[PDB]
Design a protein around this ligand. Structure first.
Ligand code: BLR
Ligand code: NA
Length: 241
């Protein structure tokens, strides 16, 4: 639960709403804690510039090997939400991820996806069908994915929200993605060893590509330095199984 968070009250309102929605989706699942390296939960650091504060919450279920919700703030202005649900490869589910970045003048980036793990880069058919039924969402300011973003599905949303209506529409789309994903997790069957290996590789590739994101790395380096940032990206955020 988030009522004991020290960062929550100080974060951009869209981030607060989305954090609450993710927590509500997870709250009644068969959750167990997942221990991050060094049992990390709150961390703060500074070098010569602004302080970075991070709060981490992490869990697992039989179908999701690691469910990570991270809230962060740089200085007074830069607010971040990071969330990934890493699937257990045995069940073949896609990777849910989202990131919101906001400053004093509003949300600059809102990204969410259900990303594929199959070698053909397609989502399972049940997901394709359910996602197609939601309809194409209308947003005024779409952003093009960076080159390492070939890991994202055709349903990936990457926008700068233009107004509160778009903020709310984006949050609702993430809730819809999570409703689909949690339902599919109930009906998922354990796969063969060969198919498990295929899904494992797709997850490894997703993690290696996400480690190429210099926008994350520079924020971490400015507060903690190069070696800490590399450890954090490779062992805490995007760990290879
Ligand atoms: C400590 C955690 C953390 C930090 C410091 C972070 C920083 C961060 N991530 C992004 C962009 C940012 N983030 C993502 C996407 C993601 N990033 C993810 O971690 C996940 C799970 C996704 C997608 C599901 C993209 C694709 C981009 C745009 C990169 C670019 O423009 O080069 C920016 C630039 C925002 C803008 O251009 O408006 C910043 C400062 N993101 C974080 O999550
Ligand atoms: Na506009």
């Amino acid at each position: 639960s988030l009522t004991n968070s020290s960062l929550m009250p100080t974060l951009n309102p869209m981030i607060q709403q989305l954090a609450l929605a993710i927590a509500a989706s997870w709250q009644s699942l068969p959750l167990k804690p997942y221990q991050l390296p060094e049992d990390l939960g709150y961390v703060e650091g500074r070098l010569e510039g602004e302080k970075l504060v991070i709060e981490n919450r992490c869990y697992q279920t039989p179908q999701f090997r690691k469910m990570h919700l991270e809230l962060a703030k740089v200085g007074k202005g830069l607010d971040i939400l990071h969330c990934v649900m890493f699937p257990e490869p045995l069940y073949g589910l896609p990777l849910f991820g989202c990131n919101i970045v906001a400053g004093p003048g509003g949300v600059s980036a809102a990204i969410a996806d259900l990303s594929p793990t199959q070698s053909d880069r397609q989502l399972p058919a049940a997901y394709q069908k359910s996602l197609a039924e939601l309809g194409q969402p209308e947003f005024e300011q779409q952003r093009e994915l960076p080159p390492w973003g070939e890991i994202f599905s055709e349903y990936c949303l990457f926008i700068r929200p233009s107004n509160v209506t778009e903020e709310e529409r984006f949050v609702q789309r993430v809730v819809d993605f999570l409703q689909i994903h949690c339902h599919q997790s109930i009906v998922a069957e354990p796969l063969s060893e060969a198919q498990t290996l295929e899904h494992r590789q797709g997850q490894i590739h997703y993690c290696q590509q996400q480690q190429k994101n210099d926008k994350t790395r520079r924020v971490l380096e400015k507060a903690f330095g190069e070696a800490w940032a590399e450890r954090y990206m490779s062992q805490v955020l995007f760990d290879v199984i």
